[PDB]
From a paper:
To reveal how the mitochondrial ATP synthase is modulated by lipids and organised into a dimer shaping discoid cristae in Euglenozoan mitochondria, we determined the structure of the ATP synthase dimer from E. gracilis.
This is compensated by extensions of OSCP and subunit d mediating the attachment of the peripheral stalk, which is augmented by two species-specific soluble subunits ATPTB3 and ATPTB4. The additional elements significantly increase the size of the peripheral stalk compared to yeast. The C-terminal OSCP extension contains a 13-residue proline-rich region, followed by 26 residues arranged in two helices (D240-L246, V250-A265), which contact the large matrix extension of subunit d. This interaction is further clamped by ATPTB3 and ATPTB4 of the peripheral stalk tip and p18 on F1. Thus, the E. gracilis peripheral stalk displays a different mode of interaction with the OSCP compared to all other reported ATP synthase structures. ATPTB3 is an isocitrate dehydrogenase ortholog that adopts a Rossman fold located at the tip of the peripheral stalk. The OSCP N-terminal domain contains a structurally conserved bundle of four α-helices, followed by the N-terminal extension with a terminal helix.
Author numbering:
A (entry chain H): 17 to 125, 259 to 359, 438 to 476
B (entry chain C): 12 to 168
C (entry chain B): 3 to 108, 117 to 337
D (entry chain A): 463 to 487
E (entry chain M): 222 to 264
F (entry chain T): 50 to 58
G (entry chain N): 82 to 112
The structure:
Amino acid sequence: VSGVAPTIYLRSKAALPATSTTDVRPQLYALQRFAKAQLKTATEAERAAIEADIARYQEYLDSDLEKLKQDVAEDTAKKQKLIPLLDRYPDVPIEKIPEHANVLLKKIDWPPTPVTNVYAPMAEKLALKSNPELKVLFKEALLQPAKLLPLDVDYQCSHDREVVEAKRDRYLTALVEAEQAPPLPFTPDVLQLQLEHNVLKGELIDRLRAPPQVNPLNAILAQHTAQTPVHRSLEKRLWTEVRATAVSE
Amino acid sequence: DAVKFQTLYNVLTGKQHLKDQVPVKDCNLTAIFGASWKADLNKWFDSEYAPKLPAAERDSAKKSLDLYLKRVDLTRYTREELTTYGILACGPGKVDALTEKHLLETGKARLEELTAGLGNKDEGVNAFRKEVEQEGKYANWPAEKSKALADKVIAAS
Amino acid sequence: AKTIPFVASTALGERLFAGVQKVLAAAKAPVSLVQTDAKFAPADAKYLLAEPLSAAATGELANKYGLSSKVTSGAASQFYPNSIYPSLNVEVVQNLYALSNPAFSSVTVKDESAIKLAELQKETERNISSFFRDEANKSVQATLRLACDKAIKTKADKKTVMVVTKPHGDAFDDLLAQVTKSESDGRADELRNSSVSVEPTLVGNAWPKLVMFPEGVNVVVCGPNASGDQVAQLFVGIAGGTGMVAQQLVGDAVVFTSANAEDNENPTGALLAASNLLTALGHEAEAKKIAAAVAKAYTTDRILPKELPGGKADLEAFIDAVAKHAS
Amino acid sequence: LPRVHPALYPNSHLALAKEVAVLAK
Amino acid sequence: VDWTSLPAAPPRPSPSAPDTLIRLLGSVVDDLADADKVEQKYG
Amino acid sequence: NYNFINNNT
Amino acid sequence: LSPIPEHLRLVKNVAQVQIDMLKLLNAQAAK
């Protein structure tokens, strides 16, 4: 590490740029250009529908996205009005069901059907990430991270100090991303899950009172995707992302 | 001696690439050399390379050498420190003042971080002094200068 | 009097509108500037002038006008005081697909239903991703073709060197390497004729070359990574700091710009932008008048702005001096 | 085969908007 | 003598990462060490 | 049939 | 032979899946 270094590797978490913005206009413009490209392969009917769509996106841009926020708010209002109506038996909550099941098994006392449990593995990660010790190290590592890395060995090993600074810079970003990362890997659509939970609750009680294992739902989405062009499917990614910001702001 | 200084002049003027996929830098050059870089370079220049060639090329080479020396003094800094934290945005002539500003500002910020995480201004200041001393030792920097900077930042806080 | 738009979302842009309008009226050119905003600019306007765009604003404007690349021009290093870089006849080029599209990075059993559904979903995603990849490759091709045409149009000193930053890793760098291979192995003819020396290099082995000896380089190319942003900021500063360099944005249309941080006020970058614009339209005599006025301001009166070393003065007084030197 | 609700159908709220306005009052 | 070459720096012993950093970053230290080798080569 | 629908599977 | 206990165990498994989903979302919202 030759040369009298002019500056010193002092850093602040405030100086580290942590924005995590989510822009909407460029995504919209990319949608527009994609539809423009599909126009060439489109037939006349879809050409007309796509011209209407293109004019709609240009209207959104000229009105500065307020029309789109209004539209997505309308759809989400329909959704949020829908779910409490499908809240069929609210007085009979969900944890009380296995008690009923134990009761019926006691009363009554074959190829079984399996289950795909996805949300229970993630619950195990909460048993780790929610610990106090794991957060203590986060609380004490970022404040004094030089203790962890062998900086003395690294400085002696590398003639240039720029490489050493880059290694230290990356470790913080890996740690900052770690603590701020959630247990989940994705953004769960809360409404479309409470829908299923409210419908599924509407099915178990009707089953408690009283072949193949196929899911006919998949024989509908396979038709829905076929009917729609691609730009509408991409438009769904846009509308979903706007529900995050509009609920945030 | 004269060999090493001719090699140095060639590298600065750009007539030669260094003997690997290596860049020219103050660090990556003075590490090879004996850390008497600029003084001995200028001395060998004014002794053995100026009187040889005519005066026009002498003036042009003197100009170019001064420029390249300033440019390597600029190379001393890091890329991220240069661009992101705004050391060069004003310009080379203002790099020094911007370094001073950046140092005092990041010192205040680090001090506030330490005190917010720990409190106990005595303890925070002590840990800050330890950190600054260790970083100076790591960057091959005068410990007296680092202590003076630490006291300066504390007094200015 | 033509109506060339002028995007400005800041008081900096507003005061620069007033100053540049005074300058241009004193220079007696048949155009006029129109205050607008980045989100409401008029399409079908090819040659424009602008102010420091933020990243999001560059993205929006590029998506609107079909832009692909941003060029710099450090001509003001000659005017910089105690200039360490006299006559910096090189050019930096940075791609823009990140700002135009930041989101580019991104069989339980054999039942007929599920495999059909996955096939349709993957076909949809295939179409989308293929379109986006083709667009990225086309933007990169535009950047490289622009850099090659620029190196060729320049007075070739039998070297005509093009440095190309290429940190191995991410997708943008992979695309850029692939496109360099494609162009070099494909054309080779104007290449071998003008002796255009294309060179993919790394950041640590490139930015010191650019700093110490930019004489050995004529063009620089960078993708829209942190590395490319850093090298562009390096040149933007080395040419005399934010305010002295003249930026440019090209693709399917040209808009000139001047880089400036929050605290800076030097408009010389924007004046050189105006000069380049007027040369594009045809008023080369007026552009030379403006350049001579700038040179007179920096040499005769030597009235430098506050941010710059040495002398110090305000934006509006500097522009008054510029206008009086012009007329 | 099992049953599915018109809400579990895709894009349901669009065609079910009438019943919603009739019901939520 | 070859001044144009660069001298052999002192040898770097094995990494021997710490349990604390591993617990904080399970599946990332391998990637970071690989990138460190990459940066020692190129950058 | 007695099976149950699960959209996310 | 009868499918009643297997149906009831299906119900138990699916209800525990739903409750685990609910706890996951509750812990995420709390955070």
